[PDB]
Design the sequence.
């Protein structure tokens, strides 16, 4: 526990100080003594104590940026999936062992206290989590970086499983307060909505607007042991400065920051979402302009400011910057545009067309009339450039236009982003290539230099040192601690593929993690899992494209094969699937019910017993990912080739000693390249094969007709085998698979099942399983978000990263 | 400044500690250094520093009550008009001079910092302020007392005067946080609404309810230098534990604690108000029951619990207690009722019938069906007692019933309170007598021993030591400091009526206070007032019964007399009127406009100049009362005899060296009794004269016809003299005065004007003015809230007060 060297030193005076300040906070902050104090009181006492250690560095870091005046990086995102903060802060400040000892001496278990903290679940999945990893890496690389978002009162809903169905409950994460954030009501700024434009003698004027105030809350972002503490600034909506009804109606403006939209696909043009997006953009850009003016005329703006757009969600930053520069700063259009493009860069996070933001022009006209005017002018000038570059190419003009012309006229926000950014990047090599080749081919041909790749990454602090200290320790024992912020050093572990001690230790750590996770499920849910089974894990948001359904088909295959040949040995498995479904995505909710329904049959068949178990992991979130990923043996990354832009869960599993079964999709391709394909369980159609199927038409019936085992499963689903009380329950799933499957589940069924057999074959050989694991861990280095951020810095932002310590 | 001995000692180590902790909070709490720190940052740094000094005593006091197990006093109120907390805390902890020196050494003006704090304006006027004074006195008298109310997000509206009219703005008092309160989310309790009653085998069951959570926030209440720190617990509404709409709809439940109802007359049966009232009652009584059970079977409940009902607002405590005891604790009705009556006592705060709470039975049935059932049963049994005591007296039964029988059937909450309380008190001798004589005569005849008087009081901490340290000091110089919590010792000052030094000092202090207030108005409003004028002040909520209009008639009289005889010397006056009008009270809003309109003419007449000024004091509130009252020469207390139940502003003025012009109404009668009528400017109808006018009918025309000077004023108002741009502006005021005046303004006009002449006559003689002032200050002792609370304790609660210090 405390013997772990990567967790730092428990200095005698440090431990003494920590205990004293713990007791001080219990007394003065929590207003309790030890007679009435609860575990929650103790968590908060520790949280305040740890937070105090950030303050000096936080003040000094921000003063340093004022003095040194580096180029500032502004990372704009509607989501920051931060998770818990206590352990991360202790890790980054080298205080973990000291706090562990301090709390131990006070008679407390720090790990029990850690479990009290709510996730800051201010994101849906990978995109939100990427922002969080990025904040961490930017601080570790000494960048003058600022995360800007919205402080949702309610993050992603807490998922309850009831009768085998998902139920949503409000994520009241601020119930007991947030000890990390600092409210800054003094720095509140006005955001404007609705109104109209007056074009006068001075120029355009946005008048008769309704005001919503944006109150910032600043959260410290510690770099890894470099004394850097950057800031995440999140804006909270506040009403501006019968009688009773009027006071109650303040809620309407304040609803802007009430809740995170829980849909992570199928764009719905909700006005409240558009208000949220402008809210972040308007308040953030005021901060940016203010800081620019208080630094040392707008010619130098792009030299001192970078705005990174996390998806198209903050794309309004482009017309907002133009609005400020033209209408308020009185710059000519051309200069303002030069500045805007050099300031802004855009990161694209998916190719699925239903995820794209296309706002009706009527909505923009009503809510943001000046922005619509500016967008139209941007479009006219941009299309003039297209017309000059490709004379007579009229369809190209139609395809490239920011304006989409259908029954409802809409603004394509991706097109706006490309036009208004000096850099556009995809999030894995395959994804960035498809952007240039198909999705934004017209844009690539116009401005090829704009288009970049920045393969995603994950922070090895949260995703190794925090969640898997046992693995972090056995690595450090061989190669020292430098890898923690220089993950490419993991390649040194290839020297240990034949090392008996290391092979033993890798396997020991995995078993320890599996025991711990089993203990978690027993403690929290009274669910018993076989610790001597292969932990087969698919955790990620529930999506047709991610193909949890393909996993389901395999699980039933395993079950049916057992029933056909009960005497035949099979490698025992615990198949775990978890993830949230978007509230209004019928198929996703049906998929969750199918997983639980499969479990209802499999988990109670006496012929099967502990040889096969199927469990749905409830409420998958960052804190749960930190528990389950280090316990995983097999990582399910089985999206239809061409659909997962990158993935990041894939990287977490690789770093944590799981082997991967996956398609050649997103960053899976680069992961297999790094490790060697011989060390990955790659199966299924490549993008080229998917396209060939699309060319001739996907007929699911053909696979049904040719595969007896698939036929059996579909008939079980149709006849009510997995829902005897409601035989037609899964008719919609069957219908979709048979007739309306965009993601070709049946087409990868045979290769998936065969590939899974090879997984089982290798697991039967513990030594060779572990050796292949070593080959994976050792080559996961590329997938550090430090590498990713270093690339953003050098290739887009024009800043040089530095691991150099502050005093 | 620091020379003032009543403000305590600036101990060298204390000053050193304070500076250190000030700097510590600036760094760790506010996360600022001195380079960017604002005056607000400095206020909060001081606030946290001072608050830290309360913590030990707060914990020890509450532990002491657990150990000693005294009878607990629960003061239930929908209003706690607390004002600011910083200075009060310093005064009660003897830290004022020490903090003053500490901040001075840091280069700060503590008084400038004090002005940063928002009033906790969680009350409308006298009733809310009485609760606040009561909390202070109960802590000073060492009572195990708990204030229980609602934590309104918005207190009484901030008043703006625009174009001479009142405008309401939301009182966002929590904008920058509240450094005094401690949120206690761990002690959150469920409150139930709506639903229905199931009468089963166990008994009645309240089922199918909607839940609203009540989250307590505890605020320290320091006694005067006795190491006692009691608690004010205020409940905050929290929602219980499409998708987006559902999350937004959490606002509806949370609206219960959103805003204080700003009407202090004309009862409006708003459901939201009824929810607020039950909210406080239900959550509070759960706390009471819990503490009772954790102390040492319900036979001892009234020995360990007192519930004081501040008006009928928390009257639901009566049926709620019965509900808990009968439905949940399974006591028989009779025993539960014995317990309830012995536990509960009711304080009545007015005789004006439109102020009485009469809830429609339909509303109670829908919102609180079990409570309505219980009320009906209470009524049946109570009326059985009436019928047994007064056989055949059928009208008495009708008059006494809790049920009122009109077109809409209603529950009379005052009747419920009397029936369910062992004590009922009025708030001044005249008021308590009229309760027994007329208003509740039937109830007095049934249970004469129930009926009591508890003449109101004010705390001499807030209302002398804090607001008028200069006066507190010259008093202490002669009689020591004991008077501060033993105000009857002010009688010793009668020995100084001929003392040249004291006469000089009293007058000097008043002049200093007048200069300070003049400096306040100049600084904050650029309004210049003549410092060598008599400060004639009427501050209180705007009401017809309080007769700001009578003041207006006199002001115009003064103006008209000047214009008739410009050469004739008159004592220069600054007539100040301030107070808020209820948003939907047309006449009150018209009255404010009349005051400003009179000012518009008077203040700009070159013939008048500085001889007469009329100003409307904007946003009258506790903090402003602390500024203006010590500067006042003349206190206007001119309610129609029989209408003001007590008044408390009257007492504040008396304590602070103003002479009183007033009717024989409320506590004015006792104030004049204490000082001698020769030392008060008493005028107008007595209650008996008002009744005689009522008997024959009030004809305002008769006064108009007989008084040329009144006639002139009414014609000025009617013809548009005070509104030339809108001649008919004051037609409604004229119409009411002439034809619909419930409060007989004209009937007291002549005596008021003549009495005012005598005020001016005395002011011309500085020595005799000051000698009469001494006679007032010296006899204000009875009107300490310590005296009032000592009476509540001994005569109602059955507890003995104690000025004894804690370790
Ligand atoms: O989440 C997204 C894109 N997205 C789409 C939406 C969305 C939100 C509302 C409606 C419709 C779509 N929110 N986020 N992309 C994911 O980004 C990760 C980080 O780059 C990648 O690793 C994943 O492959 C990708 O699916
Ligand atoms: O404020 C009240 C009574 N009251 C009535 C209401 C009310 C609230 C809503 C609608 C109608 C009436 N709120 N409070 N009474 C005042 O109590 C003071 C303290 O006892 C006395 O000094 C005043 O004389 C009395 O007017």
Sequence:
């Amino acid at each position: 526990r405390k013997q772990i060297s990567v967790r730092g030193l428990a200095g005698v005076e440090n431990v003494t100080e920590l205990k004293k300040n713990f007791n001080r906070h219990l007394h003065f902050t929590l207003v309790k003594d030890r007679n009435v104090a609860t575990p929650r009181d103790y968590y908060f006492a520790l949280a305040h104590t740890v937070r105090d250690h950030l303050v000096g560095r936080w003040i000094r870091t921000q003063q340093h940026y004022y003095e040194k005046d580096p180029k500032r990086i502004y990372y704009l995102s509607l989501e920051f999936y931060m998770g818990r903060t206590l352990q991360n802060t202790m890790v980054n400040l080298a205080l973990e062992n000291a706090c562990d000892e301090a709390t131990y001496q006070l008679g407390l278990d720090m790990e029990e206290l850690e479990e009290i903290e709510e996730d800051a679940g201010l994101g849906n999945g990978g995109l939100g989590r990427l922002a969080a990893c990025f904040l961490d890496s930017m601080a570790t690389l000494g960048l003058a970086a600022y995360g800007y978002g919205i402080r949702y009162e309610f993050g992603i809903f807490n998922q309850k499983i009831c009768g085998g169905w998902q139920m949503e409950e409000a994520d009241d994460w601020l119930r007991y307060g947030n000890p990390w954030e600092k409210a800054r009501p003094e720095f509140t700024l006005p955001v404007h909505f609705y109104g109209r434009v007056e074009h006068t003698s001075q120029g355009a004027k946005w008048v008769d607007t309704q005001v919503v105030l944006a109150m910032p809350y600043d959260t410290p972002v510690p770099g890894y042991r470099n004394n850097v503490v950057n800031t995440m600034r999140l804006w909270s909506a506040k009403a501006p400065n019968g009688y009773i009804q009027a006071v109650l109606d303040r809620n309407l403006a304040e609803n802007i920051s009430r809740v995170l939209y829980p849909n992570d696909n199928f764009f719905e043009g909700k006005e409240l979402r558009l208000k949220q997006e402008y809210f972040v953009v308007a308040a953030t850009l005021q901060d940016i302009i203010r800081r620019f003016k208080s630094s040392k005329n707008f010619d130098a703006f792009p030299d001192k400011v970078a705005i990174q757009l996390n998806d198209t969600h903050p794309s309004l930053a482009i017309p907002e910057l133009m609005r400020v520069l033209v209408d308020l700063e009185r710059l000519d259009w051309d200069k303002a545009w030069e500045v805007t493009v050099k300031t802004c860069a855009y990161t694209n996070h998916t190719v699925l067309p239903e995820a794209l933001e296309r706002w009706p022009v009527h909505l923009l006209e009503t809510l943001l009339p000046r922005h619509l005017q500016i967008i139209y002018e941007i479009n006219q000038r941009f299309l003039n450039r297209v017309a000059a570059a490709f004379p007579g190419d009229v369809d190209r003009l139609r395809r490239m236009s920011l304006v989409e012309e259908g029954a409802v006229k809409r603004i394509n926000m991706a097109h706006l982003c490309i036009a208004g950014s000096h850099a556009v990047n995809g999030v894995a090599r395959i994804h960035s290539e498809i952007l240039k080749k198909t999705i934004f081919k017209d844009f690539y041909e116009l401005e090829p230099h704009k288009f970049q790749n920045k393969t995603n990454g994950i922070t090895p602090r949260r995703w190794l040192v925090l969640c898997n200290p046992g693995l972090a320790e056995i690595i450090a024992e061989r190669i020292g601690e430098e890898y923690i912020s220089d993950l490419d050093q993991l390649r040194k572990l290839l020297s240990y593929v034949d090392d008996e001690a290391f092979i033993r230790d890798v396997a020991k750590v995995k078993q320890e993690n599996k025991l711990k996770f089993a203990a978690y499920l027993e403690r929290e849910y009274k669910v018993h899992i076989n610790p001597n089974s292969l932990f087969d894990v698919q955790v990620k948001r529930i999506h047709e494209y991610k193909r949890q359904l393909l996993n389901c088909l395999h699980v039933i295959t395993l079950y049916n094969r057992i029933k056909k040949e009960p005497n035949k040995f099979v490698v025992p498995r615990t198949v775990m699937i978890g993830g949230k479904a978007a509230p209004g995505y019928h198929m996703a909710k049906m998929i969750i019910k199918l997983i639980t329904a499969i479990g209802d049959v499999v988990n109670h068949d006496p012929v099967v017993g502990d040889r096969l178990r199927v469990i749905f992991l409830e409420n998958y979130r960052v804190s749960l990912a930190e528990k389950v990923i280090p316990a995983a043996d097999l990582s399910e990354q089985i999206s239809t080739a061409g659909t997962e832009a990158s993935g990041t869960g894939n990287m977490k599993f690789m770093l944590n000693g799981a082997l991967t079964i996956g398609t050649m999709d997103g960053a899976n391709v680069e992961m297999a390249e790094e490790a060697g394909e011989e060390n990955f369980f790659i199966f299924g159609m490549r993008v080229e094969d998917v396209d060939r199927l699309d060319q001739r038409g996907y007929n699911a019936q053909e696979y049904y007709d040719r595969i007896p085992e698939l036929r059996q499963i579909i008939e079980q689903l149709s006849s009510g085998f997995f829902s005897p009380k409601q035989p037609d329950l899964f008719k919609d799933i069957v219908n979709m698979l048979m007739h309306h499957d965009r993601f070709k589940v049946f087409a990868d069924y045979e290769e998936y099942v065969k590939c899974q057999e090879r997984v089982s074959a290798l697991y039967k050989n513990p030594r060779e399983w572990t050796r292949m694991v070593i080959r994976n861990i050792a080559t996961s280095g590329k997938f550090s978000s430090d590498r990713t951020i270093a690339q953003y810095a050098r290739e887009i932002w024009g800043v040089e990263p530095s691991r150099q310590r502050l005093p």
